[PDB]
Amino acid sequence: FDETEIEDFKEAFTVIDQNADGIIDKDDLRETFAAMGRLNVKNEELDAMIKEASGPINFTVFLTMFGEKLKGADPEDVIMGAFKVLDPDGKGSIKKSFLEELLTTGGGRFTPEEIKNMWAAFPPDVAGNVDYKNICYVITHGEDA
Amino acid sequence: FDETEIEDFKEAFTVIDQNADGIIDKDDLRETFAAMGRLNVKNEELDAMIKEASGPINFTVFLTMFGEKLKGADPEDVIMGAFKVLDPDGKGSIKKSFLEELLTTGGGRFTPEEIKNMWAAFPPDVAGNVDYKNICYVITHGEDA
Amino acid sequence: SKAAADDFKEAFLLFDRTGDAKITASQVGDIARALGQNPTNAEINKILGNPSKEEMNAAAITFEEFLPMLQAAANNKDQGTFEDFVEGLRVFDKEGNGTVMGAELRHVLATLGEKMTEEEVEELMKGQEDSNGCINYEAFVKHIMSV
Amino acid sequence: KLLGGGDVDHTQYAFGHTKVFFKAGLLGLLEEMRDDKLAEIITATQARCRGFLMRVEYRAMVERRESIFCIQYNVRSFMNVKHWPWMKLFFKIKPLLK
Numbered sequence: 108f109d110e111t112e113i114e115d116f117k118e119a120f121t122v123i124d125q126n127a128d129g130i131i132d133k134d135d136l137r138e139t140f141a142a143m144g145r146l147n148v149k150n151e152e153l154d155a156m157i158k159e160a161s162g163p164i165n166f167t168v169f170l171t172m173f174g175e176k177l178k179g180a181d182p183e184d185v186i187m188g189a190f191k192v193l194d195p196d197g198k199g200s201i202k203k204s205f206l207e208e209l210l211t212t213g214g215g216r217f218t219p220e221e222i223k224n225m226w227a228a229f230p231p232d233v234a235g236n237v238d239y240k241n242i243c244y245v246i247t248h249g250e251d252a
Numbered sequence: 253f254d255e256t257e258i259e260d261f262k263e264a265f266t267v268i269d270q271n272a273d274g275i276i277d278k279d280d281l282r283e284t285f286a287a288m289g290r291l292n293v294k295n296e297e298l299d300a301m302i303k304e305a306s307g308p309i310n311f312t313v314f315l316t317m318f319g320e321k322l323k324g325a326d327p328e329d330v331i332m333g334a335f336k337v338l339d340p341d342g343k344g345s346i347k348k349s350f351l352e353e354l355l356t357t358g359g360g361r362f363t364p365e366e367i368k369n370m371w372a373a374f375p376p377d378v379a380g381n382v383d384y385k386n387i388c389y390v391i392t393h394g395e396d397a
Numbered sequence: 398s399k400a401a402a403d404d405f406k407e408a409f410l411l412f413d414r415t416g417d418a419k420i421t422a423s424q425v426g427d428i429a430r431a432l433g434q435n436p437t438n439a440e441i442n443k444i445l446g447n448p449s450k451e452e453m454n455a456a457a458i459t460f461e462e463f464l465p466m467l468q469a470a471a472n473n474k475d476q477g478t479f480e481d482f483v484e485g486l487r488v489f490d491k492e493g494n495g496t497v498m499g500a501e502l503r504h505v506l507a508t509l510g511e512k513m514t515e516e517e518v519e520e521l522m523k524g525q526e527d528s529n530g531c532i533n534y535e536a537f538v539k540h541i542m543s544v
Numbered sequence: 545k546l547l548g549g550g551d552v553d554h555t556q557y558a559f560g561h562t563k564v565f566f567k568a569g570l571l572g573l574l575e576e577m578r579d580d581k582l583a584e585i586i587t588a589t590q591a592r593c594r595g596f597l598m599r600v601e602y603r604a605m606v607e608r609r610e611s612i613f614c615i616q617y618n619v620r621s622f623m624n625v626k627h628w629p630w631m632k633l634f635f636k637i638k639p640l641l642k
Contacts, residue, residue: 144255263641264634288636301629321625324617331618334611358608361616370619391618393635394626430595431602437591476588485589509549511590517597520604544599 108174109182120169131164133157186243194239203235253319254327265314276309278302331388339384348380405432405467409460420463422456428463429470435477436470438511444469479542486534496531551586553578 123139124131133153140148160168193209194201210217226234233242244252268284269276278298285293305313338354339346355362371379378387389397412428413420420428426441436444444466445452483495489505490497499522506518525540526532547557553575558565567575625631 144253144258260638260641261634264637267637267640268633284633288633297629318630321628322621324614324619325621325625326614326618330614334615337611358605359612359616361612361620369623391622393638394622394631395635426594427598430598435592435595437587438594439587440591477592481585482589482592505548506593510551510586511594513593513597517601520600521597541596544596544603 108170112182113170116170116173117166120166129165131169181246183243183247186246187240190239190243200232200235200237200239203237206236253315257327258315261315261318262311265311274310276314326391328388328392331391332385335384335388345377345380345382345384348382351381405464406460408432409463419457419459421458422450422452425458425463425466429467432467434467434470434474436473440470440473479538482538482542483534486538495535496533499526499530499532502532502534551579551582 120131121127124135125138125142126132126135133150136153136156137148137150157164160172162168164172190201191197193206207219207222210222211219229242229245232238241252265276266272269280270283270287271277271280278295281298281301282293282295302309305317307313309317335346336342338351352364352367355367356364374387374390377383386397408428408431409420410416410418412424412431422445426436426438429436429441442452450456486497486502487495489501503515503518503522506513506521507515521541522532522537525537547554553571555578556567556571556575
């Protein structure tokens with residue numbers, strides 16, 4: 108965890124903690140979702156978020172919960188560092204079959220089935236290994252941009 | 253309703269509510285129309301807009317009235333998503349007869365008569381199913397661009 | 398037999414567009430395939446005619462005729478041997494590697510024997526043939542037998 | 545390439561530099577038997593294909609299921625709305641925004 112990433116989680120903690128007391132309760136979760144447009148947010152969704160913690164969601168409990176789910180989270184500059192080492196001549200997005208072979212043949216984390224799941228929402232270019240960069244974006248901030 | 257679409261309706265609510273008290277009355281409707289160039293806006297048009305609500309037009313009454321008229325409203329990125337699946341090779345606008353056959357033969361909402369009305373203001377290319385994209389524009393924002 | 402599989406009757410309610418519990422004779426070929434049976438279209442045609450049943454005029458159905466026609470087609474599933482499917486395509490292209498050139502398999506599947514539309518041929522090659530123009534039929538016939 | 549198709553005896557003939565060679569009436573007889581034997585072999589291999597062919601159509605039909613609806617309803621809106629004061633207003637106005 109770099110310090111600017113921890114400051115981003117402190118700003119997200121303050122936007123969900125609308126009572127500003129330092130502990131995100133279930134009312135803060137529901138009023139942050141209602142301010143984003145969720146008028147139908149069920150109480151069972153709020154209870155499932157609170158069921159991931161052993162205590163109240165203060166800043167260090169929110170940081171330890173996000174730490175334990177993001178144990179391989181990598182910032183965009185280090186993902187582009189590794190992709191610039193995979194394309195060491197610069198500019199070009201690397202081939203689809205080169206990333207499939209190098210993921211498998213180096214590591215068990217790069218096994219195929221997982222490579223079909225990589226192509227599956229990370230579209231073609233991303234999946235193929237030709238573009239580059241959009242995948243670093245969606246690994247640090249999810250969903251389609 | 254995505255949250256940026258709800259923020260667009262909040263900005264349109266503030267431009268029509270020129271008294272800034274949170275409730276669009278008939279004077280706000282007339283003074284917004286006069287500021288757009290409508291010097292002859294009749295009082296019966298303002299009364300027909302207010303007759304679509306059961307109470308005063310505050311932000312949640314304006315959102316529920318627009319929700320109930322736009323129960324199949326689709327943003328431009330999801331309409332272009334579906335048209336990229338209809339043209340999965342990219343770039344090309346799809347044929348006129350292919351969209352007429354696939355609208356009818358899949359669903360009752362794609363029946364012909366309705367397909368003649370689709371060609372009728374959505375011009376040829378649009379109607380035909382060759383161009384693409386201008387129809388996504390006019391479905392999210394009406395009238396000729 | 399029931400093993401009474403009552404899900405065949407529940408799938409007949411998903412293919413009947415009128416909800417009256419009848420399925421036309423033109424849908425019976427594709428619904429036997431969707432219940433896990435692959436009778437050839439000439440076989441589906443013969444049986445029909447064999448029973449003085451005309452698929453040329455309007456047809457209705459009842460579950461009481463569709464059930465025994467699915468049970469008469471279910472004995473013919475012993476014809477689905479994958480050794481002969483992969484050896485057919487292995488005799489269709491030279492060298493010791495299972496690759497059909499793209500257009501060879503597309504024109505043979507549309508024009509040889511039971512005509513498959515070129516729309517269905519493109520939907521069966523989509524994903525298994527890459528831009529080299531070579532269809533690996535070891536994985537292609539594996540994925541065709543996955544459904 | 546042509547002879548590629550047909551439930552014909554791929555024996556009974558023979559090619560060469562200027563022409564094909566073909567049997568009648570024995571080799572002719574052979575082939576015939578052969579011909580029937582592929583309908584079998586073939587007819588059966590056709591079926592599965594046919595079968596399978598449509599089996600992929602269902603996977604597509606189904607996928608499509610909603611994307612249509614989305615498209616379906618979505619249009620309808622507009623047809624209704626585009627004639628609504630408030631909506632035209634939003635329209636001329638939608639731009640001044642940021």
